[PDB]
Every structure is written in C-alpha cells, then in structure tokens.
C-alpha cells in the first residue's frame, strides 16, 4: 500500500522469492523496509533485510535507526498493516501475523506518528 | 532504496 518495491517487482516473482528464501532460511524472516508516504526523514541505504526470527522489533528498530544515522533527538516510527508494531514482539512473530501473500513482511518508516 | 540483495542481519 505505497511500497515502491511492489511497483517494481511483480507479485509472482516476489512470492516465488519469498517462498524460496523462507524454505532456505526458516530461522529468519524476509523484511522490506521503505520510508512511509510523505515522510520527511533520512534515507535507508538498503531495503531488503533477512532478519533472525528471534530478534525483537525493538532491536530491529534500533538497528534501522543506526543505519539511517539518526541523531538521538530524531524520531522514528514503524508501521505494519496500519498498526505500530510492539517493541517486545519478535520479528518472527511479527512476520507470522503480518506477512503478505508474497511471504514478505512490509515495514514503513517515518518521522511522525501520522500515517495514511 | 538499494534492493539488489538481502542484508544478512547478525543474530
């Protein structure tokens, strides 16, 4: 819902890759991370992350902060299927709840708690 | 915005 990666990569190839990568790496989950629509915030050098399933949403959060080189004062929010995910969840749990039909998990990031 | 490869995150 406003992911460029979906625009550029048709659904059947996506699903194919998601299936394969989950088979190959069942203790990891595949995540796509893009700036939210209308977000005013530093770029992420990379978009595709293969994340250990036991890493928490908090740890992945602080990981992404670091990659953006945010300053301490700078804010960052995650959105997944129109909710903010809880920091205590594991990326594995978040993936099982939220992955789309292409077997990827999509996370939108932004500077503001405003979304739509 | 680079989408060439998957970043293997350390456990």
mmCIF file of N, CA and C in Angstrom:
data_model
loop_
_atom_site.group_PDB
_atom_site.id
_atom_site.type_symbol
_atom_site.label_atom_id
_atom_site.label_comp_id
_atom_site.label_asym_id
_atom_site.label_seq_id
_atom_site.Cartn_x
_atom_site.Cartn_y
_atom_site.Cartn_z
ATOM 1 N N UNK A 1 0.860 -1.226 0.000
ATOM 2 C CA UNK A 1 0.000 0.000 0.000
ATOM 3 C C UNK A 1 0.876 1.250 0.000
ATOM 4 N N UNK A 2 1.540 1.488 -1.125
ATOM 5 C CA UNK A 2 2.503 2.572 -1.242
ATOM 6 C C UNK A 2 3.928 2.093 -1.043
ATOM 7 N N UNK A 3 4.201 0.837 -1.401
ATOM 8 C CA UNK A 3 5.573 0.326 -1.425
ATOM 9 C C UNK A 3 6.085 0.267 -2.859
ATOM 10 N N UNK A 4 7.132 1.041 -3.127
ATOM 11 C CA UNK A 4 7.800 1.045 -4.429
ATOM 12 C C UNK A 4 8.245 -0.350 -4.856
ATOM 13 N N UNK A 5 8.669 -1.149 -3.889
ATOM 14 C CA UNK A 5 9.217 -2.463 -4.200
ATOM 15 C C UNK A 5 8.153 -3.334 -4.843
ATOM 16 N N UNK A 6 6.904 -3.138 -4.425
ATOM 17 C CA UNK A 6 5.776 -3.817 -5.047
ATOM 18 C C UNK A 6 5.531 -3.326 -6.471
ATOM 19 N N UNK A 7 5.761 -2.042 -6.702
ATOM 20 C CA UNK A 7 5.563 -1.499 -8.029
ATOM 21 C C UNK A 7 6.549 -2.177 -8.965
ATOM 22 N N UNK A 8 7.803 -2.254 -8.532
ATOM 23 C CA UNK A 8 8.904 -2.611 -9.418
ATOM 24 C C UNK A 8 9.026 -4.115 -9.610
ATOM 25 N N UNK A 9 8.472 -4.880 -8.683
ATOM 26 C CA UNK A 9 8.660 -6.325 -8.678
ATOM 27 C C UNK A 9 7.304 -7.023 -8.681
ATOM 28 N N UNK A 10 6.912 -7.587 -9.834
ATOM 29 C CA UNK A 10 5.585 -8.189 -9.914
ATOM 30 C C UNK A 10 5.353 -9.301 -8.891
ATOM 31 N N UNK A 11 4.083 -9.580 -8.627
ATOM 32 C CA UNK A 11 3.677 -10.347 -7.464
ATOM 33 C C UNK A 11 4.203 -11.777 -7.491
ATOM 34 N N UNK A 12 4.200 -12.394 -8.668
ATOM 35 C CA UNK A 12 4.559 -13.802 -8.768
ATOM 36 C C UNK A 12 6.049 -14.057 -8.511
ATOM 37 N N UNK A 13 6.889 -13.116 -8.913
ATOM 38 C CA UNK A 13 8.323 -13.196 -8.642
ATOM 39 C C UNK A 13 8.602 -12.974 -7.154
ATOM 40 N N UNK A 14 7.991 -11.934 -6.609
ATOM 41 C CA UNK A 14 8.015 -11.705 -5.182
ATOM 42 C C UNK A 14 7.676 -12.970 -4.437
ATOM 43 N N UNK A 15 6.515 -13.552 -4.731
ATOM 44 C CA UNK A 15 6.030 -14.695 -3.956
ATOM 45 C C UNK A 15 7.017 -15.857 -4.096
ATOM 46 N N UNK A 16 7.448 -16.084 -5.327
ATOM 47 C CA UNK A 16 8.482 -17.070 -5.631
ATOM 48 C C UNK A 16 9.732 -16.891 -4.754
ATOM 49 N N UNK A 17 10.273 -15.683 -4.728
ATOM 50 C CA UNK A 17 11.465 -15.412 -3.919
ATOM 51 C C UNK A 17 11.197 -15.576 -2.411
ATOM 52 N N UNK A 18 9.999 -15.196 -1.974
ATOM 53 C CA UNK A 18 9.667 -15.245 -0.543
ATOM 54 C C UNK A 18 9.569 -16.690 -0.117
ATOM 55 N N UNK A 19 8.922 -17.482 -0.956
ATOM 56 C CA UNK A 19 8.783 -18.898 -0.686
ATOM 57 C C UNK A 19 10.149 -19.553 -0.567
ATOM 58 N N UNK A 20 11.005 -19.286 -1.551
ATOM 59 C CA UNK A 20 12.313 -19.904 -1.622
ATOM 60 C C UNK A 20 13.149 -19.510 -0.420
ATOM 61 N N UNK A 21 13.125 -18.223 -0.075
ATOM 62 C CA UNK A 21 14.015 -17.711 0.970
ATOM 63 C C UNK A 21 13.579 -18.190 2.369
ATOM 64 N N UNK A 22 12.278 -18.430 2.543
ATOM 65 C CA UNK A 22 11.755 -18.972 3.814
ATOM 66 C C UNK A 22 12.056 -20.451 3.945
ATOM 67 N N UNK A 23 11.997 -21.164 2.822
ATOM 68 C CA UNK A 23 12.451 -22.554 2.796
ATOM 69 C C UNK A 23 13.926 -22.641 3.155
ATOM 70 N N UNK A 24 14.730 -21.769 2.563
ATOM 71 C CA UNK A 24 16.166 -21.875 2.715
ATOM 72 C C UNK A 24 16.595 -21.408 4.107
ATOM 73 N N UNK A 25 15.890 -20.422 4.649
ATOM 74 C CA UNK A 25 16.298 -19.807 5.902
ATOM 75 C C UNK A 25 15.104 -19.753 6.874
ATOM 76 N N UNK A 26 14.650 -20.923 7.326
ATOM 77 C CA UNK A 26 13.449 -20.961 8.168
ATOM 78 C C UNK A 26 13.626 -20.370 9.564
ATOM 79 N N UNK A 27 14.850 -20.090 10.002
ATOM 80 C CA UNK A 27 15.011 -19.380 11.277
ATOM 81 C C UNK A 27 15.163 -17.873 11.073
ATOM 82 N N UNK A 28 14.885 -17.406 9.854
ATOM 83 C CA UNK A 28 14.972 -15.986 9.520
ATOM 84 C C UNK A 28 13.693 -15.534 8.818
ATOM 85 N N UNK A 29 13.377 -14.244 8.929
ATOM 86 C CA UNK A 29 12.289 -13.672 8.124
ATOM 87 C C UNK A 29 12.687 -12.536 7.192
ATOM 88 N N UNK A 30 12.103 -12.554 5.995
ATOM 89 C CA UNK A 30 12.365 -11.561 4.998
ATOM 90 C C UNK A 30 11.514 -10.294 5.147
ATOM 91 N N UNK A 31 12.179 -9.161 5.255
ATOM 92 C CA UNK A 31 11.521 -7.903 5.506
ATOM 93 C C UNK A 31 11.916 -6.857 4.463
ATOM 94 N N UNK A 32 10.910 -6.165 3.933
ATOM 95 C CA UNK A 32 11.082 -4.964 3.120
ATOM 96 C C UNK A 32 10.797 -3.701 3.937
ATOM 97 N N UNK A 33 11.753 -2.763 3.954
ATOM 98 C CA UNK A 33 11.645 -1.530 4.731
ATOM 99 C C UNK A 33 11.784 -0.302 3.822
ATOM 100 N N UNK A 34 10.718 0.480 3.749
ATOM 101 C CA UNK A 34 10.706 1.728 2.998
ATOM 102 C C UNK A 34 10.153 2.843 3.851
ATOM 103 N N UNK A 35 10.695 4.034 3.644
ATOM 104 C CA UNK A 35 10.077 5.287 4.048
ATOM 105 C C UNK A 35 8.563 5.328 3.805
ATOM 106 N N UNK A 36 7.788 5.711 4.817
ATOM 107 C CA UNK A 36 6.338 5.952 4.622
ATOM 108 C C UNK A 36 6.087 7.033 3.584
ATOM 109 N N UNK A 37 4.900 7.010 2.966
ATOM 110 C CA UNK A 37 4.477 8.109 2.097
ATOM 111 C C UNK A 37 4.475 9.427 2.849
ATOM 112 N N UNK A 38 5.141 10.426 2.272
ATOM 113 C CA UNK A 38 5.132 11.810 2.758
ATOM 114 C C UNK A 38 6.001 11.992 3.977
ATOM 115 N N UNK A 39 6.750 10.958 4.315
ATOM 116 C CA UNK A 39 7.697 11.048 5.415
ATOM 117 C C UNK A 39 8.867 11.970 5.043
ATOM 118 N N UNK A 40 9.369 12.694 6.041
ATOM 119 C CA UNK A 40 10.435 13.669 5.866
ATOM 120 C C UNK A 40 11.561 13.221 6.770
ATOM 121 N N UNK A 41 12.444 12.408 6.216
ATOM 122 C CA UNK A 41 13.378 11.660 7.042
ATOM 123 C C UNK A 41 14.445 11.008 6.180
ATOM 124 N N UNK A 42 15.611 10.816 6.784
ATOM 125 C CA UNK A 42 16.767 10.234 6.119
ATOM 126 C C UNK A 42 16.515 8.912 5.418
ATOM 127 N N UNK A 43 17.233 8.730 4.323
ATOM 128 C CA UNK A 43 17.117 7.533 3.508
ATOM 129 C C UNK A 43 17.756 6.321 4.161
ATOM 130 N N UNK A 44 17.242 5.160 3.788
ATOM 131 C CA UNK A 44 17.811 3.893 4.182
ATOM 132 C C UNK A 44 18.578 3.342 2.992
ATOM 133 N N UNK A 45 19.852 3.032 3.218
ATOM 134 C CA UNK A 45 20.733 2.638 2.134
ATOM 135 C C UNK A 45 20.233 1.353 1.485
ATOM 136 N N UNK A 46 19.725 0.443 2.311
ATOM 137 C CA UNK A 46 19.188 -0.823 1.844
ATOM 138 C C UNK A 46 17.728 -1.000 2.280
ATOM 139 N N UNK A 47 17.036 -1.765 1.455
ATOM 140 C CA UNK A 47 15.603 -2.008 1.533
ATOM 141 C C UNK A 47 15.263 -3.431 2.018
ATOM 142 N N UNK A 48 16.095 -4.412 1.689
ATOM 143 C CA UNK A 48 15.775 -5.808 1.977
ATOM 144 C C UNK A 48 16.620 -6.422 3.108
ATOM 145 N N UNK A 49 15.917 -6.941 4.097
ATOM 146 C CA UNK A 49 16.553 -7.438 5.286
ATOM 147 C C UNK A 49 16.104 -8.854 5.583
ATOM 148 N N UNK A 50 17.084 -9.725 5.787
ATOM 149 C CA UNK A 50 16.848 -11.088 6.217
ATOM 150 C C UNK A 50 17.244 -11.179 7.682
ATOM 151 N N UNK A 51 16.237 -11.255 8.533
ATOM 152 C CA UNK A 51 16.352 -10.935 9.940
ATOM 153 C C UNK A 51 16.152 -12.210 10.792
ATOM 154 N N UNK A 52 17.030 -12.453 11.785
ATOM 155 C CA UNK A 52 16.785 -13.626 12.597
ATOM 156 C C UNK A 52 15.439 -13.511 13.303
ATOM 157 N N UNK A 53 14.747 -14.635 13.389
ATOM 158 C CA UNK A 53 13.365 -14.622 13.802
ATOM 159 C C UNK A 53 13.267 -14.260 15.271
ATOM 160 N N UNK A 54 14.325 -14.542 16.009
ATOM 161 C CA UNK A 54 14.339 -14.249 17.458
ATOM 162 C C UNK A 54 14.670 -12.799 17.876
ATOM 163 N N UNK A 55 15.295 -12.021 16.991
ATOM 164 C CA UNK A 55 15.438 -10.560 17.170
ATOM 165 C C UNK A 55 14.104 -9.872 17.452
ATOM 166 N N UNK A 56 14.045 -9.005 18.467
ATOM 167 C CA UNK A 56 12.794 -8.297 18.775
ATOM 168 C C UNK A 56 12.583 -7.129 17.824
ATOM 169 N N UNK A 57 11.350 -6.658 17.770
ATOM 170 C CA UNK A 57 11.010 -5.480 16.979
ATOM 171 C C UNK A 57 11.818 -4.264 17.475
ATOM 172 N N UNK A 58 12.061 -4.195 18.782
ATOM 173 C CA UNK A 58 12.925 -3.161 19.369
ATOM 174 C C UNK A 58 14.346 -3.160 18.829
ATOM 175 N N UNK A 59 14.935 -4.342 18.741
ATOM 176 C CA UNK A 59 16.303 -4.474 18.278
ATOM 177 C C UNK A 59 16.381 -4.121 16.811
ATOM 178 N N UNK A 60 15.400 -4.581 16.046
ATOM 179 C CA UNK A 60 15.358 -4.226 14.627
ATOM 180 C C UNK A 60 15.174 -2.715 14.431
ATOM 181 N N UNK A 61 14.278 -2.119 15.209
ATOM 182 C CA UNK A 61 14.152 -0.666 15.310
ATOM 183 C C UNK A 61 15.481 0.079 15.509
ATOM 184 N N UNK A 62 16.236 -0.301 16.541
ATOM 185 C CA UNK A 62 17.491 0.384 16.868
ATOM 186 C C UNK A 62 18.534 0.108 15.804
ATOM 187 N N UNK A 63 18.411 -1.042 15.165
ATOM 188 C CA UNK A 63 19.267 -1.385 14.044
ATOM 189 C C UNK A 63 19.020 -0.413 12.914
ATOM 190 N N UNK A 64 17.751 -0.171 12.615
ATOM 191 C CA UNK A 64 17.416 0.667 11.462
ATOM 192 C C UNK A 64 17.762 2.132 11.743
ATOM 193 N N UNK A 65 17.407 2.637 12.934
ATOM 194 C CA UNK A 65 17.898 3.934 13.409
ATOM 195 C C UNK A 65 19.370 4.114 13.049
ATOM 196 N N UNK A 66 20.190 3.139 13.444
ATOM 197 C CA UNK A 66 21.623 3.269 13.293
ATOM 198 C C UNK A 66 21.975 3.367 11.824
ATOM 199 N N UNK A 67 21.274 2.620 10.995
ATOM 200 C CA UNK A 67 21.600 2.611 9.574
ATOM 201 C C UNK A 67 21.255 3.924 8.899
ATOM 202 N N UNK A 68 20.262 4.613 9.450
ATOM 203 C CA UNK A 68 19.843 5.910 8.921
ATOM 204 C C UNK A 68 20.776 7.014 9.460
ATOM 205 N N UNK A 69 21.546 6.664 10.494
ATOM 206 C CA UNK A 69 22.456 7.580 11.189
ATOM 207 C C UNK A 69 21.686 8.652 11.915
ATOM 208 N N UNK A 70 20.515 8.304 12.441
ATOM 209 C CA UNK A 70 19.705 9.287 13.123
ATOM 210 C C UNK A 70 20.495 9.799 14.305
ATOM 211 N N UNK A 71 20.226 11.031 14.696
ATOM 212 C CA UNK A 71 20.731 11.545 15.947
ATOM 213 C C UNK A 71 19.780 11.091 17.034
ATOM 214 N N UNK A 72 20.261 11.092 18.260
ATOM 215 C CA UNK A 72 19.425 10.712 19.381
ATOM 216 C C UNK A 72 18.083 11.461 19.366
ATOM 217 N N UNK A 73 18.093 12.756 19.062
ATOM 218 C CA UNK A 73 16.870 13.559 19.133
ATOM 219 C C UNK A 73 15.852 13.213 18.033
ATOM 220 N N UNK A 74 16.293 12.484 17.013
ATOM 221 C CA UNK A 74 15.460 12.303 15.835
ATOM 222 C C UNK A 74 14.470 11.179 16.113
ATOM 223 N N UNK A 75 13.239 11.330 15.640
ATOM 224 C CA UNK A 75 12.196 10.333 15.894
ATOM 225 C C UNK A 75 12.076 9.359 14.729
ATOM 226 N N UNK A 76 11.622 8.163 15.047
ATOM 227 C CA UNK A 76 11.387 7.144 14.046
ATOM 228 C C UNK A 76 10.193 6.296 14.483
ATOM 229 N N UNK A 77 9.292 5.990 13.561
ATOM 230 C CA UNK A 77 8.119 5.152 13.873
ATOM 231 C C UNK A 77 8.039 4.066 12.813
ATOM 232 N N UNK A 78 7.605 2.871 13.203
ATOM 233 C CA UNK A 78 7.350 1.782 12.248
ATOM 234 C C UNK A 78 5.853 1.605 11.997
ATOM 235 N N UNK A 79 5.436 1.352 10.760
ATOM 236 C CA UNK A 79 4.065 0.936 10.548
ATOM 237 C C UNK A 79 4.012 -0.379 9.797
ATOM 238 N N UNK A 80 3.134 -1.270 10.223
ATOM 239 C CA UNK A 80 2.910 -2.525 9.513
ATOM 240 C C UNK A 80 1.418 -2.833 9.505
ATOM 241 N N UNK A 81 0.850 -3.030 8.315
ATOM 242 C CA UNK A 81 -0.606 -3.166 8.147
ATOM 243 C C UNK A 81 -1.439 -2.204 8.959
ATOM 244 N N UNK A 82 -1.106 -0.926 8.883
ATOM 245 C CA UNK A 82 -1.847 0.112 9.574
ATOM 246 C C UNK A 82 -1.824 -0.018 11.101
ATOM 247 N N UNK A 83 -0.800 -0.655 11.657
ATOM 248 C CA UNK A 83 -0.532 -0.552 13.104
ATOM 249 C C UNK A 83 0.933 -0.306 13.391
ATOM 250 N N UNK A 84 1.194 0.291 14.541
ATOM 251 C CA UNK A 84 2.546 0.358 15.074
ATOM 252 C C UNK A 84 2.870 -0.938 15.813
ATOM 253 N N UNK A 85 3.921 -1.657 15.389
ATOM 254 C CA UNK A 85 4.166 -2.975 15.989
ATOM 255 C C UNK A 85 4.769 -2.830 17.390
ATOM 256 N N UNK A 86 4.474 -3.773 18.293
ATOM 257 C CA UNK A 86 5.029 -3.641 19.652
ATOM 258 C C UNK A 86 6.510 -4.040 19.734
ATOM 259 N N UNK A 87 7.292 -3.327 20.544
ATOM 260 C CA UNK A 87 8.752 -3.471 20.523
ATOM 261 C C UNK A 87 9.181 -4.842 21.064
ATOM 262 N N UNK A 88 8.310 -5.447 21.866
ATOM 263 C CA UNK A 88 8.625 -6.692 22.550
ATOM 264 C C UNK A 88 8.372 -7.914 21.673
ATOM 265 N N UNK A 89 7.567 -7.760 20.625
ATOM 266 C CA UNK A 89 7.335 -8.849 19.685
ATOM 267 C C UNK A 89 8.646 -9.271 19.044
ATOM 268 N N UNK A 90 8.728 -10.521 18.608
ATOM 269 C CA UNK A 90 9.878 -10.953 17.839
ATOM 270 C C UNK A 90 9.539 -10.748 16.366
ATOM 271 N N UNK A 91 10.568 -10.574 15.544
ATOM 272 C CA UNK A 91 10.396 -10.346 14.131
ATOM 273 C C UNK A 91 9.709 -11.567 13.534
ATOM 274 N N UNK A 92 10.014 -12.738 14.080
ATOM 275 C CA UNK A 92 9.303 -13.965 13.730
ATOM 276 C C UNK A 92 7.811 -13.917 13.975
ATOM 277 N N UNK A 93 7.415 -13.471 15.152
ATOM 278 C CA UNK A 93 6.009 -13.302 15.475
ATOM 279 C C UNK A 93 5.382 -12.232 14.582
ATOM 280 N N UNK A 94 6.106 -11.138 14.357
ATOM 281 C CA UNK A 94 5.554 -10.055 13.590
ATOM 282 C C UNK A 94 5.333 -10.552 12.181
ATOM 283 N N UNK A 95 6.270 -11.353 11.712
ATOM 284 C CA UNK A 95 6.188 -11.911 10.372
ATOM 285 C C UNK A 95 4.981 -12.854 10.275
ATOM 286 N N UNK A 96 4.724 -13.653 11.301
ATOM 287 C CA UNK A 96 3.662 -14.650 11.143
ATOM 288 C C UNK A 96 2.294 -13.988 11.144
ATOM 289 N N UNK A 97 2.174 -12.933 11.937
ATOM 290 C CA UNK A 97 0.959 -12.136 11.979
ATOM 291 C C UNK A 97 0.738 -11.295 10.718
ATOM 292 N N UNK A 98 1.813 -10.730 10.177
ATOM 293 C CA UNK A 98 1.645 -9.635 9.265
ATOM 294 C C UNK A 98 2.126 -9.900 7.849
ATOM 295 N N UNK A 99 2.842 -10.992 7.581
ATOM 296 C CA UNK A 99 3.398 -11.123 6.208
ATOM 297 C C UNK A 99 2.267 -11.130 5.207
ATOM 298 N N UNK A 100 2.515 -10.571 4.021
ATOM 299 C CA UNK A 100 1.540 -10.556 2.949
ATOM 300 C C UNK A 100 1.603 -11.845 2.151
ATOM 301 N N UNK A 101 0.835 -11.877 1.071
ATOM 302 C CA UNK A 101 0.672 -13.084 0.271
ATOM 303 C C UNK A 101 1.910 -13.414 -0.546
ATOM 304 N N UNK A 102 2.884 -12.505 -0.565
ATOM 305 C CA UNK A 102 4.147 -12.777 -1.250
ATOM 306 C C UNK A 102 5.213 -13.342 -0.286
ATOM 307 N N UNK A 103 4.780 -13.670 0.933
ATOM 308 C CA UNK A 103 5.654 -14.165 2.002
ATOM 309 C C UNK A 103 6.681 -13.142 2.519
ATOM 310 N N UNK A 104 6.533 -11.871 2.147
ATOM 311 C CA UNK A 104 7.300 -10.808 2.779
ATOM 312 C C UNK A 104 6.522 -10.065 3.846
ATOM 313 N N UNK A 105 7.284 -9.549 4.801
ATOM 314 C CA UNK A 105 6.830 -8.561 5.739
ATOM 315 C C UNK A 105 7.265 -7.154 5.359
ATOM 316 N N UNK A 106 6.288 -6.257 5.294
ATOM 317 C CA UNK A 106 6.481 -4.882 4.911
ATOM 318 C C UNK A 106 6.420 -3.931 6.107
ATOM 319 N N UNK A 107 7.483 -3.148 6.283
ATOM 320 C CA UNK A 107 7.521 -2.117 7.300
ATOM 321 C C UNK A 107 7.786 -0.745 6.679
ATOM 322 N N UNK A 108 6.867 0.171 6.958
ATOM 323 C CA UNK A 108 7.000 1.549 6.547
ATOM 324 C C UNK A 108 7.597 2.333 7.702
ATOM 325 N N UNK A 109 8.532 3.249 7.418
ATOM 326 C CA UNK A 109 9.120 4.058 8.478
ATOM 327 C C UNK A 109 8.909 5.548 8.235
ATOM 328 N N UNK A 110 8.849 6.269 9.328
ATOM 329 C CA UNK A 110 8.594 7.690 9.256
ATOM 330 C C UNK A 110 9.104 8.451 10.458
ATOM 331 N N UNK A 111 9.156 9.777 10.292
ATOM 332 C CA UNK A 111 9.495 10.706 11.375
ATOM 333 C C UNK A 111 8.328 11.067 12.327
ATOM 334 N N UNK A 112 7.101 10.762 11.934
ATOM 335 C CA UNK A 112 5.933 11.306 12.623
ATOM 336 C C UNK A 112 4.938 10.195 12.850
ATOM 337 N N UNK A 113 4.186 10.260 13.961
ATOM 338 C CA UNK A 113 3.078 9.320 14.177
ATOM 339 C C UNK A 113 1.795 9.752 13.420
ATOM 340 N N UNK A 114 1.929 9.829 12.095
ATOM 341 C CA UNK A 114 0.850 10.203 11.191
ATOM 342 C C UNK A 114 1.012 9.311 9.978
ATOM 343 N N UNK A 115 -0.077 8.733 9.511
ATOM 344 C CA UNK A 115 0.027 7.678 8.553
ATOM 345 C C UNK A 115 -1.228 7.573 7.741
ATOM 346 N N UNK A 116 -1.064 7.440 6.426
ATOM 347 C CA UNK A 116 -2.187 7.369 5.500
ATOM 348 C C UNK A 116 -1.883 8.004 4.148
ATOM 349 N N UNK B 1 17.067 2.550 -0.241
ATOM 350 C CA UNK B 1 16.478 2.252 -1.582
ATOM 351 C C UNK B 1 17.252 1.260 -2.477
ATOM 352 N N UNK B 2 18.447 0.822 -2.085
ATOM 353 C CA UNK B 2 19.063 -0.313 -2.779
ATOM 354 C C UNK B 2 18.288 -1.592 -2.440
ATOM 355 N N UNK B 3 17.808 -2.283 -3.473
ATOM 356 C CA UNK B 3 17.118 -3.558 -3.313
ATOM 357 C C UNK B 3 17.792 -4.740 -4.045
ATOM 358 N N UNK B 4 19.102 -4.661 -4.285
ATOM 359 C CA UNK B 4 19.823 -5.729 -5.000
ATOM 360 C C UNK B 4 19.961 -7.029 -4.212
ATOM 361 N N UNK B 5 20.151 -6.920 -2.907
ATOM 362 C CA UNK B 5 20.448 -8.087 -2.112
ATOM 363 C C UNK B 5 19.896 -7.934 -0.711
ATOM 364 N N UNK B 6 19.752 -9.069 -0.049
ATOM 365 C CA UNK B 6 19.224 -9.130 1.287
ATOM 366 C C UNK B 6 20.361 -8.970 2.267
ATOM 367 N N UNK B 7 20.157 -8.094 3.240
ATOM 368 C CA UNK B 7 21.133 -7.815 4.253
ATOM 369 C C UNK B 7 21.040 -8.905 5.306
ATOM 370 N N UNK B 8 22.077 -9.725 5.427
ATOM 371 C CA UNK B 8 22.046 -10.771 6.437
ATOM 372 C C UNK B 8 22.305 -10.140 7.771
ATOM 373 N N UNK B 9 21.259 -9.923 8.553
ATOM 374 C CA UNK B 9 21.409 -9.421 9.915
ATOM 375 C C UNK B 9 21.986 -10.436 10.936
ATOM 376 N N UNK B 10 22.975 -9.996 11.706
ATOM 377 C CA UNK B 10 23.603 -10.861 12.706
ATOM 378 C C UNK B 10 22.590 -11.248 13.792
ATOM 379 N N UNK B 11 22.618 -12.511 14.244
ATOM 380 C CA UNK B 11 21.785 -12.888 15.394
ATOM 381 C C UNK B 11 22.367 -12.454 16.743
#
